[PDB]
Design a binder for this molecule. Structure first.
Ligand SMILES: *C(=O)/C=C/c1ccc(O)cc1
Length: 125
């Protein structure tokens, strides 16, 4: 395990520039998106929660393609606002239900330090 807790205050610094293998060591799901929602990174813990294959989703659009249940004001709307302001930092519960048994999660979206990059962290609740 990487020794990092979900929700930690400086998570963006600890995860800055992490390679794919290190991201796979986290206790929680971690996705990195560009400002349009294209998937740049997707870790093993996320794939175990959602069923998606972390290798196959890279390059797909999270809102248009992988996760249409998040294409709503309550998820995508918050993402795109926080991308626009440059200070996205929001934590909220949500249910994932596309082509899967519904599962309720806690989501933490936070701007990454690297350019045009935004984290989406997920754990079960
Ligand atoms: C709703 O369509 C949610 C889908 C989903 C959420 C998170 C993922 O990592 C993959 C699919």
């Amino acid at each position: 395990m990487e020794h990092v807790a979900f929700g930690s205050e400086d998570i963006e610094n600890t995860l800055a520039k992490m390679d794919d293998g290190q991201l796979d060591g986290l206790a929680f799901g971690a996705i990195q998106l560009d400002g349009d929602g294209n998937i740049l990174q997707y870790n093993a813990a996320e794939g175990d929660i959602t069923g998606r294959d972390p290798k196959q989703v890279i390059g797909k659009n999270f809102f248009k393609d992988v996760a249409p249940c998040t294409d709503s004001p309550e998820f995508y709307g918050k993402f795109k606002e926080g991308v626009a302001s440059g200070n996205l930092n929001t934590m909220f519960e949500y249910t994932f239900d596309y082509q899967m048994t519904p599962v309720k999660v806690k989501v933490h979206m936070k701007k990454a330090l690297s350019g045009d990059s935004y984290w989406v962290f997920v754990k079960r609740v």
